[PDB]
Design an enzyme around this catalytic site. Structure first.
Site, short mmCIF file in Angstrom:
data_model
loop_
_atom_site.label_atom_id
_atom_site.label_comp_id
_atom_site.label_asym_id
_atom_site.label_seq_id
_atom_site.Cartn_x
_atom_site.Cartn_y
_atom_site.Cartn_z
N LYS A 201 58.91 -39.53 6.98
CA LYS A 201 57.50 -38.31 6.16
C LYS A 201 56.86 -39.29 6.24
CE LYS A 201 59.90 -41.39 2.77
NZ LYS A 201 60.62 -40.48 0.77
N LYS B 150 57.41 -57.22 0.59
CA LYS B 150 58.21 -55.95 -0.38
C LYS B 150 60.08 -57.31 -0.85
CE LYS B 150 61.32 -52.65 0.99
NZ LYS B 150 61.34 -50.84 2.54
N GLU C 271 48.87 -44.49 2.29
CA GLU C 271 49.25 -43.50 2.89
C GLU C 271 49.47 -42.41 3.60
OE1 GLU C 271 52.57 -42.90 -0.20
OE2 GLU C 271 53.36 -44.99 0.15
N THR D 293 66.03 -38.05 2.41
CA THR D 293 64.60 -37.63 0.85
C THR D 293 65.34 -36.20 1.91
OG1 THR D 293 62.58 -39.04 0.87
CG2 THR D 293 62.32 -36.86 0.36
N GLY E 72 53.81 -50.01 -3.56
CA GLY E 72 54.43 -49.09 -3.17
C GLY E 72 55.69 -49.64 -4.71
N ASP F 173 58.79 -48.84 6.29
CA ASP F 173 60.31 -48.15 5.97
C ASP F 173 61.30 -47.52 6.20
OD1 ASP F 173 61.96 -48.45 3.57
OD2 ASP F 173 61.60 -46.35 2.56
N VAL G 54 48.75 -53.07 6.08
CA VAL G 54 48.50 -51.35 5.88
C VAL G 54 47.27 -51.00 4.98
CG1 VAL G 54 48.64 -49.77 7.29
CG2 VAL G 54 49.77 -51.36 7.42
N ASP H 61 64.20 -42.44 8.05
CA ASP H 61 63.09 -41.83 6.94
C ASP H 61 61.80 -41.22 6.83
OD1 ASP H 61 63.34 -41.25 3.58
OD2 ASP H 61 62.88 -43.66 4.17
N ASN I 223 56.46 -42.71 4.24
CA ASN I 223 56.63 -43.62 5.48
C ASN I 223 55.52 -43.66 7.00
OD1 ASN I 223 58.08 -44.53 3.66
ND2 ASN I 223 60.28 -44.19 4.59
C1 LIG Z 1 55.26 -51.70 3.03
C2 LIG Z 1 55.25 -51.23 1.99
C3 LIG Z 1 54.04 -50.56 1.74
C4 LIG Z 1 53.14 -50.85 2.61
C5 LIG Z 1 51.86 -50.75 2.09
N1 LIG Z 1 51.00 -51.26 2.24
N2 LIG Z 1 51.20 -52.17 3.27
C6 LIG Z 1 52.23 -52.10 4.15
C7 LIG Z 1 53.50 -51.69 2.94
C8 LIG Z 1 54.27 -51.87 3.93
CL LIG Z 2 58.72 -50.92 4.10
#
Ligand SMILES: c1ccc2cnncc2c1
Ligand SMILES: [Cl-]
Ligand SMILES: [Cl-]
Ligand SMILES: [Cl-]
Ligand SMILES: [Cl-]
Length: 280
Positions: A140, A41, A99, A179, A19, A160, A95, A138, A143
């Site tokens: 959506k 992150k 998304e 958003t 992301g 998020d 994960v 947030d 997320n």
């Molecule tokens: C936050 C943002 C993106 C992610 C992508 N894949 N796994 C976990 C995540 C946590």
């Molecule tokens: Cl996150």
């Protein structure tokens, strides 16, 4: 609060990017000591007290504090936190299925059961958060992430927590704005906010899950926000002709301007359908 200041590269190797946002970038990573994989992150710090670039330490500490409290199957787990002069680095649960936004885009339109299968998990996660007096602010499809996108009924996790707040007085009055397509009227109008705002966002998500269309989307952010405040949406027959009246009832009871009249998370779980910001 202070975080681990050792170089994160001495403990993790990074890979594919997962992301990329305005203030954060997420990279897949692997912990050297265990071989376990996570999502790192990297949140950019603000470099001067008066700057608008980066995230304030207050905002970073809030996100971390909330993430440390939570543990539930439908919410992301925080593993550890590092920092250096430029970034705070959150090592988060991986994960891997991507998304929900991408799943919806790549896949043909969902059936009403497929929609409720996702929705029930989102509601369970939000029930947990609200029980803790945590507003997400947030919610959506971008997320929500799927554990494995190749099973008939994918499992999901809410991600998020960058805008999330503890609501210990019933409402908060801070600089909070998500958003445009998903924000509640009280967000658009700069009014005090509580757990109710998330319930509105769930109504928007539900509308999208069933139809593939966004209920308040205009051609510009200002149009979208004006539509939200006026509750200017309708169920288009072209997209809802095969959707049950009871699904529409559920949505109608969430897309309510007066937050006091909107369904709560507990109301949503007992509803008959379920019960078993600027342009530049
Ligand atoms: C936050 C943002 C993106 C992610 C992508 N894949 N796994 C976990 C995540 C946590
Ligand atoms: Cl996150
Ligand atoms: Cl990796
Ligand atoms: Cl971001
Ligand atoms: Cl606070």
């Amino acid at each position: 609060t202070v975080f681990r200041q050792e170089n994160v590269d001495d403990y993790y190797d990074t890979g594919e990017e997962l992301g990329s946002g305005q203030f954060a970038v997420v990279k897949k990573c692997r912990e050297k000591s265990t071989g376990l994989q996570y999502a790192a992150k990297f949140i950019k710090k603000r470099r001067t007290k008066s700057s608008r670039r980066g995230v304030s330490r207050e905002d970073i500490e809030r996100e971390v504090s909330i993430l440390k409290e939570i543990q539930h199957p439908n919410v992301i787990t925080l593993h550890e936190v590092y920092e250096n002069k430029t970034d705070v680095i959150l090592i988060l649960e991986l994960v891997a299925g991507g998304e929900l936004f991408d799943f919806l885009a790549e896949k043909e339109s969902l059936t009403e059961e497929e929609a409720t299968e996702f929705l029930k998990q989102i509601l369970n996660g939000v029930y947990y958060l609200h029980s803790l007096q945590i507003a997400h602010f947030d919610l959506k499809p971008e997320n929500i992430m799927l554990l494995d996108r190749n099973v008939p009924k994918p499992r999901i996790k809410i991600i998020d927590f960058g805008l999330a707040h503890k609501i210990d007085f019933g409402n908060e009055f801070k600089n909070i704005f998500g958003t445009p397509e998903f924000v509640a009227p009280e967000i658009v109008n700069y009014e005090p906010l509580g757990l109710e705002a998330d319930m509105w966002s769930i109504g928007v998500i539900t509308y999208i899950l069933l139809s593939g269309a966004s209920p308040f989307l205009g051609d510009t952010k200002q149009e979208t926000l004006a539509n939200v405040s006026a509750v200017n949406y309708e169920f288009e027959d072209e997209y809802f002709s095969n959707t049950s009246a009871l699904a529409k009832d559920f949505i109608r009871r969430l897309l309510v301007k007066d937050p006091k009249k909107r369904m709560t998370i507990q109301d949503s779980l007992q509803h008959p359908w379920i019960k078993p910001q600027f342009e530049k």
